[PDB]
Amino acid sequence: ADDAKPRVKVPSSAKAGETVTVKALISHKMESGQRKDADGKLIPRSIINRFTCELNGVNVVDVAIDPAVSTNPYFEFDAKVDAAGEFKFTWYDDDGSVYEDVKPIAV
Amino acid sequence: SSTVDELTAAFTGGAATGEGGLTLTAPEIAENGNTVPIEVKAPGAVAIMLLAAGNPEPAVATFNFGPAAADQRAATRIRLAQTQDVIALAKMADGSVVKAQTTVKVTIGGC
Incomplete structure (x- = not known):
């Protein structure tokens, strides 16, 4: 899709072993398949169907997303930060697009 | 049976749900059905599933x-078409599932 713009809020550093809260959003209409037009016709579904967050090659969360998840999908969850590296965020579109984001973290 | 019960049964492997160890946070009254904040919390769970x-x-x-x-812990924003019950299901390492449930009032129905 067009303009699938990631927005991640996470601390750029942590103490060794510290929990940090991760907040990840991306811009997406999340056409759910339930909405009707003025002709009274259902508008076809097209959503982001999966979100993953990895820290240093290791999954933090893996989310399977359904149409009831709101426009501009927002996920918030907690990471155990053992060592310096990076988060990698991935979003999978119903249309075959894959969106990615990368955020460093110092320890 | 219902769709919620068919998804629940697939998630438990044909077993009844149990209780305890899972917190479902939703607003008593959600102003906008299009975007309702939900948090689920379950120490030890391998997976938590959300149903409206x-x-x-x-x-x-x-x-x-x-x-x-x-x-x-996970938090998200969801769509609720009208006042309804939200269900959280938390599966543990041993494959057993616990259910938490709460009713959400919706002022502006979603969609």
Whole structure:
């Protein structure tokens, strides 16, 4: 899709072993398949169907997303930060697009 | 049976749900059905599944926590078509599932 713009809020550093809260959003209409037009016709579904967050090659969360998840999908969850590296965020579109984001973290 | 019960049964492997160890946070009254804040919390759970029992397609999301998760908390924003019950299901390492449930009032129905 067009303009699938990631927005991640996470601390750029942590103490060794510290929990940090991760907040990840991306811009997406999340056409759910339930909405009707003025002709009274259902508008076809097209959503982001999966979100993953990895820290240093290791999954933090893996989310399977359904149409009831709101426009501009927002996920918030907690990471155990053992060592310096990076988060990698991935979003999978119903249309075959894959969106990615990368955020460093110092320890 | 119902769709919620068919998804629940697939998630438990044909077993009844249990109780305890899972917190479902939703607002008593959600002003906007299009965007309702939900938090689920379940120490030790391998996965937490979210269902909205009054939606046409009741499945919301299934949160799988990897080894790098500090804890088994997840928050999101969901759609509720009208006043309804929200259901959280938390599956433990041994495959057993606990159910938490709460009713959400919706002022502006979603969609």
